[PDB]
Amino acid sequence: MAIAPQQIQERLKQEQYQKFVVADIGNFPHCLAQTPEGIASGQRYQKYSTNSLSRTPPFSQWGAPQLLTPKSAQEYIKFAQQRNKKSSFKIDGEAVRVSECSNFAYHSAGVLLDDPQIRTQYDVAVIGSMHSNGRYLHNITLLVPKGSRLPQPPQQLTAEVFPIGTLIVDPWAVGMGHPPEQALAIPKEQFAYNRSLFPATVNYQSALDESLTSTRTGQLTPYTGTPS
Amino acid sequence: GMVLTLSDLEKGYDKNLNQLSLSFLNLRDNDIPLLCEFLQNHPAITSLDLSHNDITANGVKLFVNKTSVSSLNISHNNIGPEGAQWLSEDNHITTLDVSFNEIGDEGVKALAANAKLITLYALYNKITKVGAGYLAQSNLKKIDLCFNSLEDEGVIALASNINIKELIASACDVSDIGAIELAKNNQLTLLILGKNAITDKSTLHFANNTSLSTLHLGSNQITAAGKKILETNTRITDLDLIGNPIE
């Protein structure tokens, strides 16, 4: 049962990434989108920032960059699992989930890797994008159709070797207020940060992950239900 | 042109704010004449958002000095160094966003020489310490330079610019060397230096700063000791340290 890109997008929409506390709004205020969702995310950050519970675990560490890219599928799925679990911290009665531009892509990677149909149609990749003088400032999750390989560091991923049918998943962009059509399971041409996509470095490839086959699916529950 | 339509223009026309927003429409250079015609027909529109399109330097040439637009967002296009050079010739623009356009040091060289500019957003533009040198001589009151490898030499130059009141420079390869010189600055009222390599070594200088009321130092290397020092400065009403290895 082939899953459509829209069905993949709707799955990611269920995670309500726009409801996250985006912790590096304090670092990159100008990355807030000119949308209702961007306006709301800015307000949610302000309240979070001035709330003492933000300086308690695991929220405090959730805001901290995780520089080491996870090399096992299970870690990604665990990342999504732990981010979604209920907590006592609420902002105006709202569960608090926290991420940033380096770790946000890990959540989506987990969600995507946890679907049995995704794993047969797509390889999952996590890349460092937004290249600046040897550093890659923005992590992104890729859905690569099966059987297309990606360059391994120090080789860079470029437009020329970007596999046809690759879908981009950037929940950080959604946290910042971009609509799903610009960030969740879409071709690069529709991607909000297409202008900083290449060059990129590929830090994780599910196709090179030998623990993948032993890694199970269907561990996660969609954070919300679909409206009718 | 071949993409922009009258329907796009009227849906993008916010008559309450006198603002025209045309982001994500894949507009090209050839669409600029129609755009300017519409703006000339509605002179009250002085704020324009052209972000996330496919405009090049040629499109800028078709736009500049056509309208009374004073606030322009043309981020996430492809205008390059020459596009920035041309914008620097515009006689109405005072607030400009050219982020994500690969304008480079040469692009910023022109913009920094434009005394009309009050506010410049130029995130991710391959701006280096050389470009920061140019901006250090500008009359800009606010600059946002996130995702540009300015390095210490870069922000040290910027720190000498007496005109800048607000500086945003997160993920700019700034260490304690650069941060300390920015701390010594007596004009900045807002400074954001997230995602850099700043440590507790800078914090005494920020504690003794007398100008800042906003200071964001998230996702650096600051510890609880640095936090304690920073919190002695009560002039800073907005202090952000999220993401530092505190406690």
Author numbering:
A (entry chain a): 1 to 228
B (entry chain A): 0 to 246
Quoted from the paper:
To that end, we performed detailed structure‐function analysis of a completely uncharacterized set of proteins: the putative metaeffector LegL1, a leucine‐rich repeat (LRR) protein (de Felipe et al, 2005), and its cognate effector, RavJ. After using Y2H and gel filtration analysis to demonstrate a physical interaction between LegL1 and the N‐terminal domain of RavJ, we cocrystallized and determined the crystal structure of this novel effector–effector complex. The co‐crystal complex of LegL1 (blue) bound to RavJ (1–226, red) was solved to a resolution of 2.0 Å. The heterocomplex has a 1:1 stoichiometry, with LegL1 forming a canonical LRR horseshoe‐shaped structure arching over and interacting with the RavJ active site identified above. LegL1 forms a canonical leucine‐rich repeat structure arching over the predicted active site of RavJ. The interface spans 1,240 Å2 and is reinforced by LegL1 K194 projecting into the RavJ active site where it forms a hydrogen bond with the predicted catalytic residue C101 (inset). LegL1 acts as a direct antagonist by blocking the active site of RavJ.
Among all bacterial pathogens, Legionella pneumophila maintains the largest known set of translocated substrates, delivering over 300 proteins to the host cell via its Type IVB, Icm/Dot translocation system. In at least nine instances, this regulation is direct—a hallmark of an emerging class of proteins called metaeffectors, or “effectors of effectors”. Through detailed structural and functional analysis, we show that metaeffector activity derives from a diverse range of mechanisms, shapes evolution, and can be used to reveal important aspects of each cognate effector's function. After release into the host cell, translocated bacterial substrates (effectors) regulate one another through several different functional interactions: indirectly, through counteracting modification of a shared host target, or directly through either steric complex formation or direct modification of one effector by another.
